[PDB]
């Protein structure tokens, strides 16, 4: 009956598998992901798989020939697809929390780097973390009378911003604005070491420039009344 599966209810659909030798990985679609996650409960055949975390290998829950998917969506949207894979790949896994330059605090003091011109091309360096370090002069006392936004012009990167070693924020290609507010507690009178950790995400990447913009400059005037 319905194409959307996008509104509260219990939805059922039916699909067919040949041999059970493949891996059947259910993707909930880009519609599903929200900052407040969607209460959608997956069943494969009559068996409960779980709430939708994200993508799931459903191969355990399915049988040769015809199968069902049910979705009790209480709230939110999905657009489910099953990707079918020849193998799931064996290997030992290891983790690190953070990165070498991050856990050595290169945002406080990096080693020296090579100088680059303002259009920094990074798409060659894709798959890697580049630290772009800059000094910006700010020759005046920093105040909430003249707040500072750092604007980064870039593409193809996920960039973490640090000002004088204080972590300011993140910017990504799909972030809604290219500006971070940097507080008067981060900014220094004199030189500001403003540093970008760019995880370089694409063969097109680059940073085109930095600016600190004062959003406005108000006069704080002390007004005095003799009685």
């Amino acid at each position: 009956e319905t194409y959307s599966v996008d509104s509260p209810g219990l939805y059922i659909t039916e699909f067919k598998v040949d041999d059970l030798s493949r891996h059947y990985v259910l993707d909930p679609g880009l519609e599903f992901y929200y900052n407040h996650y969607y209460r959608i409960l997956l069943f494969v055949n009559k068996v409960y798989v779980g709430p939708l975390i994200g993508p799931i290998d459903i191969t355990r829950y399915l049988k040769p020939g015809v199968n069902e998917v049910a979705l009790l969506v209480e709230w939110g949207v999905v657009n489910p697809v099953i990707g079918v894979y020849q193998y799931k790949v064996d290997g030992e896994w290891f983790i690190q929390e953070g990165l070498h330059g991050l856990i050595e605090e290169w945002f406080r003091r990096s080693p020296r780097g090579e100088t680059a011109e303002p259009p920094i091309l990074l798409g060659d360096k894709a798959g890697r973390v580049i630290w772009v370090n800059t000094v910006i002069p700010y020759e005046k006392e920093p105040t909430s009378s003249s707040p500072v936004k750092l604007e980064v012009d870039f593409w193809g990167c996920r960039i973490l911003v640090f000002v004088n070693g204080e972590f300011i924020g993140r910017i990504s290609d799909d972030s809604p604005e290219r500006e971070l507010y940097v507080p008067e507690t981060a900014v220094r009178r004199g030189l500001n070491n403003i540093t970008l950790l760019a995880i370089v995400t694409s063969r097109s990447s680059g940073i085109r420039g930095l600016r600190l913009k004062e959003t406005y400059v108000h006069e704080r005037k002390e007004i005095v009344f003799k009685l």
């Binding site: 290169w106 990096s110 100088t115 920094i120 973390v129 630290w131 370090n133 800059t134 940073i207 930095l210």
Partner: peptide, 9 residues
């Protein structure tokens, strides 16, 4: 910026 300095992590 006065200068931009690159380091590969």
């Amino acid at each position: 910026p006065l200068e931009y300095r690159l380091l590969e992590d």
